[model samples]
Target: LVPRGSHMVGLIWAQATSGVIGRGGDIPWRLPEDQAHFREITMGHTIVMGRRTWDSLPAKVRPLPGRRNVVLSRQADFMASGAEVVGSLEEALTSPETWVIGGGQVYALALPYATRCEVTEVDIGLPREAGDALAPVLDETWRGETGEWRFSRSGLRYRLYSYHRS
Candidate 1:
């Protein structure tokens, strides 16, 4: 069983080899290929995330163009110009194409319910304090397949990991 409406849940994230996903509200590394992959996979789908994740997008890119941006926030009147703000994960996860895009807490909260996970594993680390947010440590039962490994023009070696629950 998945989140709701017979939809399968998937989680997508980018993390340093050390497991850090971001510093404050932004990602520490910029890999254009990874960005393309993210855009390709989630394009035209529903993206679900937390309020901070919602804010992390560049102001010009607010509400994430092309996809349905569904934000999970506790505020009763939470809303973003181009997004549909929901009060809970259950409320946000209303489609089969829904994706859990993260900021640590959202990732952790969505993990158990995710039927699949798409991760970009970057081979690098941020400053210790910037290591606060991380990818959830998935259980062994969730097996993964490695995508083509590539090095960024920035020289960071990175790869994609796609996992599915058995």
Candidate 2:
């Protein structure tokens, strides 16, 4: 097993200025570029997510093809056909390199162990009811000066902040 502090616990996700991540079992908006960004970074890693977030994915993308999708579910019998469904986040985090993918609770629980965070800071605001928020309590230790700030051709302003816990 990889030593605790040595393993790269990466967090890759997008959020509105209101801290809203997804709503109605789906992300609030569509950004093909953002989607591509996620796929690019997570291609060879193990992705961890909460149960509802797992089901929220469309049928075609359910098990997100290239990576090992480790879904956290309390239901002992929960199954995703191809992905591994584990009852504990601690068990799921054992992967050598991990990406804490989505949903509020999962993100909150995984934050302390994260070594890096890749966040797409979107420019808009989303209502709480219409926005599913991700929980991550970041402090001064996460330096964001080196973030890759970019925008979409359609005028969507989002900076891909790459923060490392010091």
Candidate 3:
């Protein structure tokens, strides 16, 4: 969480049971419903991420619509077009309502500062090292409520979980 009187930060991501969030730069599975769920969660807030996460998005949707895109990059001259570029997590937290929409590193950096987390639990068959990126482990301080599992167009069973830090 953030300062006692300051706004809270949220983290949103999807991961396999094996903890894989990305295979290379792309997600290992496709779920349009999850996509919509993500859009709905961060639609009116600033979405924060790292440079790689920014680069991983398709060109056409680079600056994800309906939200303020804030990219955290250590590269001094790197510019995330249509998004504000910040060098650190502290800088990215300026927004009153920011969602750490990540790459592995960014997620890890943002975890301690996040008060809410929305996770899409995917039922996938993969090994622990299958993906280059993984979801952050939600520790016991956070309480999660289970969601109903639903089948995607491709028949992949997935469910959502909303967690609040206690």
Candidate 4:
């Protein structure tokens, strides 16, 4: 079942040939703006991500301060100091507003429940070996709109695209 009042937002840095898996290896494109934007929207919101993604960050940064950090993991006993670990997607949707900050697998799993999506589409392309992880291909049924384009501190061009179920 789709989640009501739930929106999945992802901050990804991807190239044309780089699939979702490939995208995860690199640090997100713009750290400053990305962190600022994340803070603005998720200041008091619940943010959800996969176990692997959560593990990728250092312990100090594990549970993003202020907001509720929910980690989706299959292990029932998995635990983090400031994060909640849940075994299923339904558990993550319990929050009134949830953002699915991801690792490709998590995004793919949560896409169906997402009432809305916010994606940063990058202008570059990747090499084929970047492999495996690829962002989900959005369709017209998703109802998305491109926001005003902007350049990052690194001068990489990107645009925020907001998607909603039609």
Relative to the unseen true structure, what is the C-alpha lDDT of residue 134 in candidate 4, on a scale of 0 to 100?
66
Q: Which ten residues in a row have the lowest lDDT in candidate 2?
A: 126-135
User: Scored by Cα lDDT, where does model 2 land?
Assistant: 0.82
* Clash count list over all predictions: 0, 1, 0, 8
Residue-by-residue lDDT tens digits, candidate 1, 32-137: 9898999988998899988888888877987788999888888978768888988878777777778898889899888878889999998886645734787898
TM-scores for candidates 1 onward, in order: 0.91, 0.88, 0.93, 0.79
lDDT of 4 by residue, 30-90 (tens): 4366567657766787888888778777877778988899898888888777888888887
How close to the true structure is residue 162 of candidate 3, measured as C-alpha lDDT?
Answer: 96
After TM-score superposition, the amount by which residue 29's alpha carbon in candidate 1 deviates from its true location, in angstroms, is: 1.2
- Arrange candidates, best lDDT first: 3, 1, 2, 4
What's the lDDT for candidate 1?
0.85
TM-score of 1: 0.91
- TM-score between model 4 and native: 0.79
Model 3 worst lDDT run, 10 consecutive residues: 1-10
* lDDT of model number 4: 0.68
Q: Report per-prediction Cα RMSD to one decimal.
A: 2.8, 2.8, 2.6, 4.0
lDDT of 3: 0.89
Top candidate when judged by TM-score against the true structure: 3
The lDDT of each candidate is 0.85, 0.82, 0.89, 0.68
